[PDB]
Amino acid sequence: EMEKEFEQIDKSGSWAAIYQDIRHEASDFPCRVAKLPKNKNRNRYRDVSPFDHSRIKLHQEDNDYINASLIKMEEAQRSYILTQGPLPNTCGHFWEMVWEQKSRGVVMLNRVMEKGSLKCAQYWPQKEEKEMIFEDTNLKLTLISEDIKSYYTVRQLELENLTTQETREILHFHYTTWPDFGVPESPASFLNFLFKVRESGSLSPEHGPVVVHCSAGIGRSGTFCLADTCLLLMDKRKDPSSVDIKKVLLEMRKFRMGLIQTADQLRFSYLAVIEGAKFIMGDSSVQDQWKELSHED
């Protein structure tokens, strides 16, 4: 049971060991396509690749490769696409993927510049009047509006397939204060953001999988997805005790390597799930408490 386990790990100060055990047991599958010479410039990090078996394929004859994985959580009945921060040459691919996969939401957990380096290309328009066209994939992207809070911003985007003139609304959820290799300020501020994404309808099975990324698409992204899936599993069963967090993380790691980068991110995942469980089990008041504690305004 998660809460008892949490206290036992804390008391014995063994988060590092628990986390390393997960690294040790984690799945290992080939990433041969990602490692092809022709794809070298499509990868942000040499050592972070999608497994072949779960990679997202772009629907183009030329090169179907993008550094992105479909995390398909069978029991939870929710899917996520985890991906790296797009590069200057893969922003067209990124939006092609969003289009083809019918995603309604994009969750961004990093800033474009972190610790002096460019962790992500500027892949969305920052001004209404300066829309972006991706010539390679024939897509147009327009900023429609944005709602800026103290630590996150929600943007409304219009994605147009120039080939069909079909348009879709994409919601962009941008968490701006989550440190690389770090954790959110609090469970409250994390859960407040997660519930914004949930309340948008972006996670509905009627849409394609939400796209989740940070810089490498594994650390912060893995933390976000683990917490969401655990809360969803608990919700479907109305039984917080039935959820084995480490087992869920290991399942997710079948679909993308390295999910959750540090022991404290793992510890933080417990914190968020334990706190979120309050809402799941019928304490609706905690949601406004998180909002307040998060200092949105």
Ligand SMILES: O=C(O)COc1c(C(=O)O)sc(-c2cccc(N(C(=O)c3ccccc3)C3CCCCC3)c2)c1Br
């Ligand atoms: O989102 C976060 O919290 C941190 O995200 C990340 C980065 C960033 O935002 O700059 S860079 C990054 C990354 C890139 C390449 C390799 C690795 N991996 C490491 O063990 C590692 C960790 C720190 C420094 C160098 C390597 C291994 C290599 C084997 C596969 C798993 C990761 C990690 C991650 Br992850």
